[PDB]
Amino acid sequence: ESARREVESQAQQQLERAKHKPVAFAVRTNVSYCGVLDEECPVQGSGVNFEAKDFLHIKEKYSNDWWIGRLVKEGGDIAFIPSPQRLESIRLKQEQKARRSGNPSSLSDIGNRRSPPPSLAKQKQKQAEHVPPYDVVPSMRPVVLVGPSLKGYEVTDMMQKALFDFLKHRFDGRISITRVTADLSLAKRSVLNNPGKRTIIERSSARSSIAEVQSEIERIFELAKSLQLVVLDADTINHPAQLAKTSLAPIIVFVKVSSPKVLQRLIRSRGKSQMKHLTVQMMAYDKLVQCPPESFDVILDENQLEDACEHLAEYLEVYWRATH
Amino acid sequence: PFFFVNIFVALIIITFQEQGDKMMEEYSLEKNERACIDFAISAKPLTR
Amino acid sequence: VWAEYDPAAWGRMPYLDMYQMLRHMSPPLGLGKKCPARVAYKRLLRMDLPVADDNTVHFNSTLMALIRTALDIKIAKGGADKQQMDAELRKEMMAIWPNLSQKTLDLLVTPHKSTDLTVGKIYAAMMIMEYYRQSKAKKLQAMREEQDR
Amino acid sequence: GYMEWISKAEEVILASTFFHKKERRMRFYIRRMVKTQA
Amino acid sequence: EEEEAANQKLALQKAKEVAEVSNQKPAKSVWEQRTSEMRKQNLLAS
């Protein structure tokens, strides 16, 4: 048929002219689906075989079923990503190939109970959580580095400011530093339509700190859309799970001492002031160690300044090559 | 005469390299087993 | 000691005198005059010397296994691993002693035939018979102490 | 290693002896000189 | 040995972040060889 070939050429021409255009926004995936094996794509042979925990960057507009996106892998070509409605449609296609999907079991019961599919067998039900296949995340990851024990104290604050200095100096002109003075752990998306929309409601949450924390989420989004990498100097979050389920989904950097025996004497090197808070300083350390390493993105487990300095330098250098 | 001289004697003793052997590193056990089995090789019962 | 037991010292001694031999000798190579019988048989089971048709054991072959069992040389716990380790040991000696005659190697490292009656097999049988006799003796006592009520 | 870590971090943020601010910067500068290979 | 082991272990963990873009030993002395053997033999007793 000439119609399929004509749209094949038009899509190819559109891709060629859009190779040097700015990126619009990015999506989040939570299911291992490959877009190259689906025959409904407009162009065959140019799909995306992306697994879970992956980044996709959509640039232009195609339709309500497919989008033009790109991978954050180095050398990744322009591919096609299914729309969130398309994934919901193909998600329904996943369990329809099975013998049964609703209530009527096939345990030697054929022709007795036909059991036509009610609303229970469709996606209308199971809406207690109903996690979307796509989540909105900033274009490029904010850099959140967690202190070995507890932020806001001398020993921990000394750890990040040294790294804060290097990222500002070596990478000047392309990195923006922002400090999140207020809380950031109250990032919720499925609580209510608009908790505390106005400050004149005099509600419990209207006069609370949730309004400012909610307003701080989109600022990180704004910094991401302008192509410069950003960091987060959040002084409250101390665990990966505290800021893992949120919509930020940021890069997590770990600074840790090899042994608590080193940390306790390092705390002692400050003076008598930290001796009052030394007790709470230690239970806050081993808790982070007990967290699985796979939750963290990068680990700085060594000792010297310079080698640890270059460890983060080359890591985001990959991130800059990858998204360019 | 007492301390430094004994340092030299100790340092040579500790770091005396093994006499050649050309470093085959093909045999597994060596150690005491190498000499003990060699005794089994050339073992002659005493004769009255 | 070995030459003293056999005044002629031909190089072969009855297997029975080995048990008396190893008790006179001091550990680790010997067993000691105070060695329990069960511990002595346990070492002999690992020693695994084949017995000649004249019921005698060779001097050199006996010496190897006493070295073998005391230094834990390439000693597998059983199975086909024994043949693999023995072949590996045979290669190493040929690499270390290329001039070693094949007869001497077969005399020191005996090729294991399943039909061969080893010293371990002889001591395994008597221990099994002793265990069976003791188990039968206990059973007869058990059926008797339970019958007097 | 970590004692070296905080030393440079403390160096950055800091950038009678207490009364004279010019003395505080001066002791900051002479502290640099001593570790120089020269 | 520790700095060698830490070197290889780090560069392998470092290579994970790089995956997207994509031995020397002097002969031991007689004192050290025998000392190592005596360590194993004594540790064999346990």
Swiss-Prot record, chain A:
Q: In which tissues or organs does this protein occur?
A: Expressed mostly in brain, colon and ovary.
Keyword entries, A-Z: Calcium, Calcium channel, Calcium transport, Cytoplasm, Ion channel, Ion transport, Phosphoprotein, SH3 domain, Transport, Voltage-gated channel
GO terms for biological process, alphabetical: calcium ion transmembrane transport via high voltage-gated calcium channel; calcium ion transport; calcium ion transport into cytosol; chemical synaptic transmission; positive regulation of high voltage-gated calcium channel activity; protein localization to plasma membrane; regulation of membrane repolarization during action potential; T cell receptor signaling pathway
Q: Where is this region: Mediates interaction with the alpha subunit?
A: 158-308
- What is its subcellular localisation? Cytoplasm
Region Disordered, as annotated, extends over 92-133
Which GO cellular component terms, listed alphabetically, does the Swiss-Prot or TrEMBL entry include? cytosol; L-type voltage-gated calcium channel complex; membrane; synapse; voltage-gated calcium channel complex
Q: Where is the SH3 domain?
A: 22-91
Instruction: Please name the GO terms that the record assigns under molecular function.
Output: calcium channel regulator activity; high voltage-gated calcium channel activity; voltage-gated calcium channel activity
Sequence positions bearing Phosphoserine: S115
Q: Which domain of life is it from?
A: Eukaryota
Subunit architecture: Component of a calcium channel complex consisting of a pore-forming alpha subunit (CACNA1C) and the ancillary subunits CACNB3 and CACNA2D1. The channel complex contains alpha, beta, gamma and delta subunits in a 1:1:1:1 ratio. Interacts with CACNA2D4. Interacts with FASLG. Interacts with CBARP; prevents the interaction of CACNB3 with the alpha subunit CACNA1C thereby negatively regulating the activity of the corresponding calcium channel.
Entry protein name: Voltage-dependent L-type calcium channel subunit beta-3
Q: What species does this protein belong to?
A: Homo sapiens
Give the gene name. CACNB3
Swiss-Prot record, chain C:
State which tissues express it: Brain specific; mainly found in cerebellum, cerebral cortex, thalamus and hypothalamus. Expressed in the small cell lung carcinoma cell line SCC-9. No expression in heart, kidney, liver or muscle. Purkinje cells contain predominantly P-type VSCC, the Q-type being a prominent calcium current in cerebellar granule cells.
Recorded superkingdom? Eukaryota
| UniProt-annotated location(s) | Cell membrane
Q: Which disease is it linked to?
A: Spinocerebellar ataxia 6: Spinocerebellar ataxia is a clinically and genetically heterogeneous group of cerebellar disorders. Patients show progressive incoordination of gait and often poor coordination of hands, speech and eye movements, due to degeneration of the cerebellum with variable involvement of the brainstem and spinal cord. SCA6 is an autosomal dominant cerebellar ataxia (ADCA), mainly caused by expansion of a CAG repeat in the coding region of CACNA1A. There seems to be a correlation between the repeat number and earlier onset of the disorder.
Q: Which family does it belong to?
A: Belongs to the calcium channel alpha-1 subunit (TC 1.A.1.11) family. CACNA1A subfamily.
What function does the entry list? Voltage-sensitive calcium channels (VSCC) mediate the entry of calcium ions into excitable cells and are also involved in a variety of calcium-dependent processes, including muscle contraction, hormone or neurotransmitter release, gene expression, cell motility, cell division and cell death. The isoform alpha-1A gives rise to P and/or Q-type calcium currents. P/Q-type calcium channels belong to the 'high-voltage activated' (HVA) group and are specifically blocked by the spider omega-agatoxin-IVA (AC P54282). They are however insensitive to dihydropyridines (DHP).
Q: What is this protein called?
A: Voltage-dependent P/Q-type calcium channel subunit alpha-1A
Query: From what organism does this protein derive?
Result: Homo sapiens (Human)
Included stretch of the parent chain: 1834 to 1982 of 2506
Curated annotation (Swiss-Prot), chain D:
| Expression by tissue | Brain specific; mainly found in cerebellum, cerebral cortex, thalamus and hypothalamus. Expressed in the small cell lung carcinoma cell line SCC-9. No expression in heart, kidney, liver or muscle. Purkinje cells contain predominantly P-type VSCC, the Q-type being a prominent calcium current in cerebellar granule cells.
Q: Can you say where in the cell this protein is located?
A: Cell membrane
Please give the coiled-coil regions recorded for this protein. Answer: none
Question: Which top-rank group of organisms is this from?
Answer: Eukaryota
Assembly, per entry: Voltage-dependent calcium channels are multisubunit complexes, consisting of alpha-1, alpha-2, beta and delta subunits in a 1:1:1:1 ratio. The channel activity is directed by the pore-forming and voltage-sensitive alpha-1 subunit. In many cases, this subunit is sufficient to generate voltage-sensitive calcium channel activity. The auxiliary subunits beta and alpha-2/delta linked by a disulfide bridge regulate the channel activity. Interacts (via C-terminal CDB motif) with CABP1 in the pre- and postsynaptic membranes. Interacts with the spider omega-agatoxin-IVA (AC P30288).
Pathology linked to this chain's protein? Spinocerebellar ataxia 6: Spinocerebellar ataxia is a clinically and genetically heterogeneous group of cerebellar disorders. Patients show progressive incoordination of gait and often poor coordination of hands, speech and eye movements, due to degeneration of the cerebellum with variable involvement of the brainstem and spinal cord. SCA6 is an autosomal dominant cerebellar ataxia (ADCA), mainly caused by expansion of a CAG repeat in the coding region of CACNA1A. There seems to be a correlation between the repeat number and earlier onset of the disorder.
**Family that this chain belongs to:** Belongs to the calcium channel alpha-1 subunit (TC 1.A.1.11) family. CACNA1A subfamily.
Protein name as annotated: Voltage-dependent P/Q-type calcium channel subunit alpha-1A
Residue window of the full protein shown:
391 to 487 of 2506
